[PDB]
Amino acid sequence: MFNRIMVPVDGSKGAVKALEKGVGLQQLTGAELYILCVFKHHSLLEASLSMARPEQLDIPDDALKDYATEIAVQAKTRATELGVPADKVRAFVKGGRPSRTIVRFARKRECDLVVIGAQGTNGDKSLLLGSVAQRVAGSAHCPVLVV
Amino acid sequence: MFNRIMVPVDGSKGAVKALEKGVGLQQLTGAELYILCVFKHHSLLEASLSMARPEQLDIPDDALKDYATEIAVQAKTRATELGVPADKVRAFVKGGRPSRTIVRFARKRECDLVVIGAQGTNGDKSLLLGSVAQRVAGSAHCPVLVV
Numbered sequence: 001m002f003n004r005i006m007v008p009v010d011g012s013k014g015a016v017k018a019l020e021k022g023v024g025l026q027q028l029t030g031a032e033l034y035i036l037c038v039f040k041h042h043s044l045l046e047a048s049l050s051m052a053r054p055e056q057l058d059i060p061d062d063a064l065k066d067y068a069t070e071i072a073v074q075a076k077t078r079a080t081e082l083g084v085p086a087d088k089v090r091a092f093v094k095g096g097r098p099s100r101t102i103v104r105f106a107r108k109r110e111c112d113l114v115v116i117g118a119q120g121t122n123g124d125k126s127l128l129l130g131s132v133a134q135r136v137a138g139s140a141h142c143p144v145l146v147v
Numbered sequence: 148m149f150n151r152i153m154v155p156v157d158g159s160k161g162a163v164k165a166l167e168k169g170v171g172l173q174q175l176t177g178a179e180l181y182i183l184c185v186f187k188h189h190s191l192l193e194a195s196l197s198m199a200r201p202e203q204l205d206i207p208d209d210a211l212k213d214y215a216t217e218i219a220v221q222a223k224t225r226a227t228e229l230g231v232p233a234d235k236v237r238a239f240v241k242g243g244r245p246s247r248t249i250v251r252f253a254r255k256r257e258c259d260l261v262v263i264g265a266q267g268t269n270g271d272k273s274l275l276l277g278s279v280a281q282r283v284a285g286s287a288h289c290p291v292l293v294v
């Protein structure tokens with residue numbers, strides 16, 4: 001019933017648990033699995049700042065992209081090791097606002113399911129939905145499996 | 148991968164779409180399907196009030212329960228229409244706070260999936276995640292498919 005399953009991943013343990021359920025559903029349906037990691041742009045952060053960040057807090061401009069890439073590749077590799085055929089899994093890295101970017105990606109690529117962690121890099125003992133999960137679950141055009 | 152799927156229903160169009168996806172997954176897995184409609188009982192509706200509700204709005208608990216029962220029974224009927232074996236689908240009606248009652252029921256009954264509408268009786272064109280959906284997705288012990 002699901003032909004193209006999207007798993008947004010952020011390098012968190014919550015996202016890995018989401019990926020694992022995505023893999024289970026992939027095996028049940030034979031769907032394509034699309035993995036996406038969104039990274040924040042330098043501009044989007046400092047655009048909404050009153051004063052500039054000190055140059056002591058500087059990072060390479062492509063360092064966030066490289067990190068997102070490693071995360072997406074970890075996820076792809078894990079998915080294939082867990083039994084998803086390599087030709088069914090595709091990994092992507094996109095710059096931008098996570099919730100916005102995830103929902104746009106899901107619509108553009110005609111994904112019929114998004115599988116997302118309940119919590120992410122800011123996870124805790126709380127049973128509150130992470131901000132990205134909350135926004136994606138609300139705004140996605142397709143069903144959203146919160147894991 | 149899902150042996151016991153729960154669909155909380157509230158009589159909304161959003162809940163109907165949730166049921167339809169729950170049935171789809173039931174047919175794929177041969178899972179048991181547990182349908183639950185929660186009614187807010189009289190003490191709960193009157194719990195945090197600065198003034199009593201007027202007579203015409205004071206609907207007694209037996210009538211609130213009867214409405215929930217009708218909804219749950221219709222959902223079971225509709226599930227069977229769409230392919231689910233009668234013996235695999237059970238309807239439940241419970242009094243209490245919906246979010247908390249749904250989460251507790253999933254845990255007690257050992258459900259491994261909850262399928263819930265993104266929106267409910269207050270649903271509209273907007274992309275706001277429903278309050279019950281938000282709370283269930285955050286607090287459920289198992290994955291929550293928000294449709």
Ligand SMILES: Nc1ncnc2c1ncn2[C@@H]1O[C@H](COP(=O)(O)OP(=O)(O)OP(=O)(O)O)[C@@H](O)[C@H]1O
Pocket residue numbers: 008009010012014015016018036037038039098115116117118119120121122123124129130131132133134
């Ligand atoms: N940048 C991102 N790229 C891809 N997926 C993401 C990204 N951020 C979050 N997610 C997805 O959303 C899930 C929930 O993460 P979310 O960011 O909502 O929670 P959190 O970080 O713990 O809380 P908050 O961000 O509100 O402090 C993650 O497990 C992941 O699946």
Ligand SMILES: Nc1ncnc2c1ncn2[C@@H]1O[C@H](COP(=O)(O)OP(=O)(O)OP(=O)(O)O)[C@@H](O)[C@H]1O
Pocket residue numbers: 154155156157159161162163165183184185186187245262263264265266267268269270271276277278279280281
């Ligand atoms: N009393 C209930 N019993 C069982 N399931 C419910 C109940 N209320 C809501 N649900 C489930 O939650 C889904 C989302 O409904 P929710 O009440 O969260 O949104 P809403 O009514 O549109 O918005 P809000 O109530 O936040 O203004 C419904 O489609 C249904 O599956």
Ligand SMILES: [Mg+2]
Pocket residue numbers: 010120121122130132
């Ligand atoms: Mg986060």
Ligand SMILES: [Mg+2]
Pocket residue numbers: 267268269277278279
């Ligand atoms: Mg509601």
